[PDB]
Each structure stands twice: as structure tokens, then as C-alpha cells.
């Protein structure tokens, strides 16, 4: 399966997906990165995996759905077959969505349903959790409501911030995008027709 990698910042977990689908057994390769913002570390690494990348800025477009488009054009252009949000910081509109129904996979740094959003440390850290973790899941329409595939339980440790918690998640974060994407690559895990999880 082919896959395209979007990111909009450091990319430890492009990192992770680079390390794990050039494994002899990967049933993944990743083709192309798409980065919404220029300069940053992301792009870096892709470019010294040899990976091609491309910097789509959303800044540039009239609105979400232009965004998406161009976003869908590089899709197309390079026969993609899987996509992966791997700290990429858009919501994605309704029918890019739709239309990547099943093959486009995001990870989150909460143990879903708890801490939908854009700041999931801070949420856990104010609601003193003693477990967070993260997901990764299919995305839907609705942000962070999409079908888990995998998800990681981490602990918090008191005097925690989210520079030290976010640490210490994202080295589960980095076992569960590259196992979640083997698991799809291979056709072991789908989204079912009734929209639930299937494992064959
Ligand atoms: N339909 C849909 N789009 C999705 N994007 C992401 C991936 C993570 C999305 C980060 C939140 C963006 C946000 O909160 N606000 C702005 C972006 C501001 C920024 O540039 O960071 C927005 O409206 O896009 C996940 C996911 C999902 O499950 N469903
Ligand atoms: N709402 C999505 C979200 O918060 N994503 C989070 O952004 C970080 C990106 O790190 P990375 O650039 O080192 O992969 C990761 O912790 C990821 O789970």
C-alpha cells in the first residue's frame, strides 16, 4: 500500500513511520509528505529518507475546501492509497473526508473519547488524570470521533507539564501509528460497512 504522511511540524512520528515501513515485512511505503507550513523539522527528515515532500499552505487558499483540493491533486498524483495525519493540525472538510473513508488514519495524544482537541495535555494535566495515552483512528467527519484502531495508556506522573508528558506519550505514540499502519496496509484491520471496526 501507498501511502502519504502529512505533517504540520517536528514529525517524531513521521520519524517512527519512515523507520518502521521501510522494514522488510512493511506492507507500507510512504510516497510523498505534505506539509501545510514550510520549514519545519518535518520536512527535514523526509528529505533525508529520500522521501519526496511537498508544502501545500493553507494560508494561500480561500477556504478549506481549495485547501483540501490541492491537498487531493498530490493524493492522486502520487497513486495514494493511505494517508496519515501524523501532527498535522487542520480539521479536513466533509467530502475529503468521505472520499478517503477507511484509508485515512490519525494519532491523538488522549485515550479518545476524553480530551478531544487541539490541546489534550493541558485538558488531562487541569483535569488530573492519572492515565492519558493516545489513539489512533480512523478519521470521520466529526473531529476525534472516527473508529479506534489502537490506543496506548501512559501515565502521568504528578508535577507533570505538558513538555514532560507529551514526552513521555509520544514514545507510545511512535509503537501504536506504525503498528496501527501496518495493521490497515496489510487488509488485517478495515472499517467495516456498518462503519464499526472490522479485524479479518
Ligand atoms: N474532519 C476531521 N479533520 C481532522 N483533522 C485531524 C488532524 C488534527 C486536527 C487539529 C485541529 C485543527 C484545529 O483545531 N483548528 C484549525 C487549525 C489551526 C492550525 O493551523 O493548527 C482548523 O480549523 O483546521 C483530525 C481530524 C478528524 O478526526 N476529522
Ligand atoms: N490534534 C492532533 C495532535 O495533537 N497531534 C499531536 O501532535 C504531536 C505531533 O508531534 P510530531 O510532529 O513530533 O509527530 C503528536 O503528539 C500528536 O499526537
Not at 513521521?14 to 514550510?38: G, H, M
Amino acid at each position: 500500500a501507498r501511502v502519504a504522511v502529512l505533517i504540520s511540524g517536528t514529525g517524531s512520528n513521521l520519524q517512527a513511520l519512515i523507520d518502521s515501513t521501510r522494514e522488510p515485512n512493511s506492507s507500507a511505503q510512504i510516497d510523498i509528505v505534505i506539509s501545510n507550513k514550510a520549514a519545519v523539522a518535518g520536512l527535514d527528515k523526509a528529505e533525508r529518507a529520500g522521501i519526496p515532500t511537498r508544502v501545500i499552505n493553507h494560508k494561500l487558499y480561500k477556504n478549506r475546501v481549495e485547501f483540501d483540493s490541492a491537498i487531493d491533486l498530490v493524493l492522486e498524483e502520487f497513486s495514494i492509497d493511505i494517508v496519515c495525519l501524523a501532527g498535522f493540525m487542520r480539521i479536513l472538510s466533509g467530502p475529503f473526508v468521505q472520499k478517503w473513508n477507511g484509508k485515512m488514519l490519525n494519532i491523538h495524544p488522549s485515550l479518545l473519547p476524553s480530551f478531544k482537541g487541539s490541546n489534550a495535555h493541558e485538558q488531562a494535566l487541569e483535569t488530573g488524570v492519572t492515565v492519558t495515552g493516545c489513539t489512533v483512528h480512523f478519521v470521520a467527519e466529526d473531529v476525534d470521533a472516527g473508529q479506534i484502531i489502537l490506543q496506548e495508556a501512559v501515565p502521568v506522573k504528578r508535577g507533570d507539564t505538558v513538555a514532560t508528558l507529551s514526552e513521555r506519550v509520544k514514545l507510545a505514540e511512535h509503537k501504536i501509528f506504525p503498528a496501527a499502519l501496518q495493521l490497515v496496509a496489510s487488509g488485517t484491520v478495515q472499517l467495516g460497512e456498518n462503519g464499526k471496526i472490522c479485524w479479518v
